[PDB]
Amino acid sequence: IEGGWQGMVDGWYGYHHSNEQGSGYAADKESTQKAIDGVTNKVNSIIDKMNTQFEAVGREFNNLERRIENLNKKMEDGFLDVWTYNAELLVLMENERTLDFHDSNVRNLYDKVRLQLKDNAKELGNGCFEFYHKCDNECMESVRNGTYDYPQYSEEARLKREEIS
Amino acid sequence: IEGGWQGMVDGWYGYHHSNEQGSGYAADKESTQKAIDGVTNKVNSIIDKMNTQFEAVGREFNNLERRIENLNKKMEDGFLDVWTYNAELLVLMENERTLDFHDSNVRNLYDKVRLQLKDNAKELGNGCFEFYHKCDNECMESVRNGTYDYPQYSEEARLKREE
Amino acid sequence: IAGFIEGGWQGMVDGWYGYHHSNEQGSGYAADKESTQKAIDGVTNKVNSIIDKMNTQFEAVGREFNNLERRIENLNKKMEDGFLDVWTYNAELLVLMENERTLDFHDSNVRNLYDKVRLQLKDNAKELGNGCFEFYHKCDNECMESVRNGTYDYPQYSEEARLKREEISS
Ligand SMILES: *[C@H]1O[C@H](CO)[C@@H](O[C@@H]2O[C@H](CO)[C@@H](O)[C@H](O)[C@H]2NC(C)=O)[C@H](O)[C@H]1NC(C)=O
Ligand SMILES: *[C@H]1O[C@H](CO)[C@@H](O)[C@H](O)[C@H]1NC(C)=O
């Protein structure tokens, strides 16, 4: 799958079809909503799990108390280093996960289509299927539904498949 | 592949079949054991990698040493915040991974079956294969064994499709 | 000669992921250079971010409290021990976690390479079930290249493939 549909506005993952009647985009609302809910939950947990207490970070040691002030410096610097590393790596790690999540969702959508069409359509290798029969707007809907009737078009599909000969 | 078998008790991942003789569950013991070993290892590493040394957390500063007591408070609170966040996020993260691990294992089990019976089965979308030939209890066992004899049923298979 | 799902090619010195073919003209290994380079770049980036994101400042860790300042020395001990525990756990778990991810990454890349082939050679070749495809037609060195390219012309060999598909029976 090469890139994304700027023309598809209504969702995150979906379909594009073209036939004799015309062409258009249609979003898969189920998988889109699950993905939006998951990603929102990810961002929220990363925010909500932080538990911050009250504190008064202010330096109140005198010039004959510099060993204690240094002890405080080591501590403040220590926590800055811990949080910086953990925050940075958490972001890098969860970003990798989020992008793979989207990849995984598109693939599942592609396989749900593939397993219906079998040899009634040619996998073009770019996320698109070329049909071996005439697939109208009702036929296209059934492919999104998960109700595509394979035997109904299988004969017609078999003629055009060996018509290449 | 939607939903788990309450009827399948003997393992974690497995098979359900239905034929003329009846229907029933059977667990895949190889992939189940790998999954149990991995998950147990995950829990153990999360426990074992912690090293807690001895210490005496006790407050022993007087009423003219409150700046030092506050310094200790900032420290104790600091570590409580670090451990709380890391523990919480570690759990949430590894739980996501554990559930995807199971998903991944089921898919591998499904592919092992798919590659063993090419044109002999009709892939449905729910993790299920509809056979194009009559597959009895012996035939079903061989699919679990990993020694399903494809050529033996291959001819019969090409007939039910055009019926 | 096996496939991916029963070990690696010691004979493929070329790259990380790739192909092995055998036909009448001969046999050999061929690395997929695109996916190999992406994997090397990703893994190198992983190692570099894990190193580069660390931010270390100057400090003079030395114990300079006297024998009537042991409560303060203990406060320092709790702190030093605290950070040692935090870094140890995080470092250990980061390594274990990212190693799992790295190995699954490689697994995933090999599977993608296998599927790109499978979806081209539909019923023109037999999935042997060990990462290898047995062709039902004569596939020469140009034919093999096209399978790696992603340009394999299925209709061109489909008829020949259908003739041989019905032999074992009669
Ligand atoms: C999913 O789309 C399918 C497309 O086949 C719908 O079924 C068709 O509906 C049309 C008009 O609504 C009817 O003429 C037929 O009953 C169906 N067509 C065929 C060829 O059988 C189906 O209604 C859609 N899903 C839902 C839940 O409505
Ligand atoms: C596995 O089950 C089959 C039944 O199809 C049986 O014939 C065979 O003996 C079993 N395999 C082995 C190696 O014993």
Numbering used by the authors:
A (entry chain B): 10 to 174
B (entry chain F): 10 to 172
C (entry chain D): 6 to 175
Question: What does the report in the manuscript say about this coordinate set?
Answer:
Herein, we report the antigenic properties, receptor-binding specificities, and crystal structures of hemagglutinins of three different H5N1 clades responsible for recent fatal human infections in geographically distinct areas: A/Egypt/N03072/2010 (Egypt10, clade 2.2.1), A/Hubei/1/2010 (Hubei10, clade 2.3.2.1) and A/Anhui/1/2005 (Anhui05, clade 2.3.4). The overall structures of the three H5 HAs are similar to that of Viet04, comprising a trimer of HA0 protomers, each with a globular head containing the receptor-binding site (RBS), a vestigial esterase domain, and a membrane-proximal domain with its distinctive, central helical stalk and HA1/HA2 cleavage site.
The substitution Asn154Asp, which results in loss of this carbohydrate among clade 2.2.1 and 2.3.2.1 viruses, leaves the proximal residues exposed and potentially subject to selective immune pressure, thereby enhancing antigenic diversity among Egypt10 and Hubei10.
